Ligand binder design. Structure first.
Ligand SMILES: *[C@@H]1O[C@H](CO[C@@H]2O[C@@H](C)[C@@H](O)[C@@H](O)[C@@H]2O)[C@@H](O[C@H]2O[C@H](CO)[C@@H](O)[C@H](O)[C@H]2NC(C)=O)[C@H](O)[C@H]1NC(C)=O
Lengths: 53, 52, 224, 49
């Protein structure tokens, strides 16, 4: 469940390309991309917190 | 708080009082040799054996 | 499970050395710096010395800078303090405490784990036993004000004197005081109990003085 | 006098519990076989080392 996130917060982090071809600090910066699965599914870790208000 | 003597281009300020904790990302500076107010979040979506 | 256990202490003469040590348990000794802190009676906490991880840096309080030496044995998970040329001013409870890191140069941390401090007393005196005297109630003038009777324990050297009344039977209306160090180097304390004045001629009250260090027990009868 | 302390380490991935290769040492082998025999005109199955 999401009870573990009650004491957590969103954070900002540096992003090498904010879509303009220039770098900036961004709320949607990626932390890691994991591809252990062989069926081609990707698992992406981001600074955003989804499903939590 | 009005300093009353110096110029805005001379001084630095930051927010220090925080109530919620965040992931200790490699893109965020550590505030101490060892991080404080430690908590843990489990990672969802484990790997499993299936047939394609 | 995390704790520090103090060992050593006791009575030492001025000019003599004394060795203190602490055993670490429940945590990794090699992950933290260690400090010694002492607290004299009636005083707040005073930092004495500290040792960084792998003895990278050694610090001492100015008052002991040339007299105390600190070291640690990682293999034995133990901390040591060597105190030389001890003075009367060094009398205090000595505690071991664990830091929150390996370096003492981090100012974001405090001391999170403390042990049970030992007692170090520095004095040129023998373990003289107490003299006990009765303090008779002024029943002639206080009879309408309720009677107060007590006893005095005086001229003993060792700290830990225990005083009780009627072999512990009397617990209500009982007031005891902290011992006060005299210029003689000896301690004294008083004890008083408050009772109905009408009971003075019917109930006998005994002051029970127990001095463990001298294997001495004194039962003193207090009367008008 | 502004300094930064950087550290990193390598550990086995959690996925190693499922996706891995095993290095084995082979020694000897034991043969066995499933034999069909038309004994007395009937088909019987014989299993043995
Ligand atoms: C005893 O065995 C005969 C051979 O059995 C066939 O081959 C085996 C390896 C196995 O796969 C079995 O299931 C097969 O039936 C068998 O007679 C049969 O032989 C031919 C092949 O040579 C087969 O195609 C055909 O169905 C059968 N012909 C017959 C009945 O003559 C059958 O199992 C049995 N025959 C006897 C002697 O009862």
């Amino acid at each position: 469940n999401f009870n573990v996130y009650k004491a957590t917060r969103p954070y900002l982090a540096h992003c090498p390309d904010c879509g303009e071809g220039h770098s900036c600090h961004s709320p949607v910066a990626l932390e890691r991309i994991r591809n252990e699965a062989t069926d081609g599914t990707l698992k992406i870790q981001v600074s955003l917190q989804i499903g939590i208000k | 708080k009005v300093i009353n003597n110096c110029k805005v281009d001379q001084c630095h300020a930051a927010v220090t009082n925080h109530k919620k904790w965040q992931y200790n990302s490699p893109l965020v500076p550590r505030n101490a040799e060892l991080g404080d107010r430690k908590g843990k979040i489990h990672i969802p979506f484990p790997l499993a054996n299936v047939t394609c | 499970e995390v704790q520090l256990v103090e060992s050593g202490g006791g009575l030492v003469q001025p000019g003599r050395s004394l060795r203190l040590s602490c055993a670490a348990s429940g945590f990794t000794f090699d992950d933290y710096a260690m400090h010694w802190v002492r607290q004299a009676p009636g005083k707040g906490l005073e930092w004495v010395s500290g040792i960084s991880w792998n003895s990278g840096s050694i610090g001492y309080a100015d008052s002991v800078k040339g007299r105390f030496t600190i070291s640690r044995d990682n293999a034995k998970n133990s901390l040591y303090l060597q105190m030389n040329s001890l003075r009367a001013e060094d009398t205090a409870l000595y505690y071991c405490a664990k830091d929150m890191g390996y370096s003492g140069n981090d100012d974001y941390y405090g001391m999170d784990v403390w042990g049970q401090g030992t007692t170090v007393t520095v004095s040129s005196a023998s373990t003289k036993g107490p003299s006990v005297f009765p303090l008779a109630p002024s029943s002639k003038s206080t009879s309408g004000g309720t009677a107060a009777l007590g006893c005095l324990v005086k001229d003993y050297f060792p700290e830990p004197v225990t005083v009780s009344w009627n072999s512990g039977a009397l617990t209500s209306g009982v007031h005891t005081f902290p011992a006060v160090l005299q210029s003689s180097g000896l301690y004294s304390l008083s004890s008083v109990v408050t009772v109905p004045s009408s009971s003075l001629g019917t109930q006998t009250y005994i002051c029970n003085v127990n001095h463990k260090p001298s294997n001495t027990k004194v039962d003193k009868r207090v009367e008008p | 006098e502004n300094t930064q302390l950087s550290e990193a380490h390598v550990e086995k991935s959690e996925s190693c519990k499922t996706e891995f290769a095993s290095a084995y040492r082979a020694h000897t082998a034991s043969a066995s076989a499933k034999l069909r025999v038309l004994y007395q005109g009937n088909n019987i199955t014989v299993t043995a080392y």
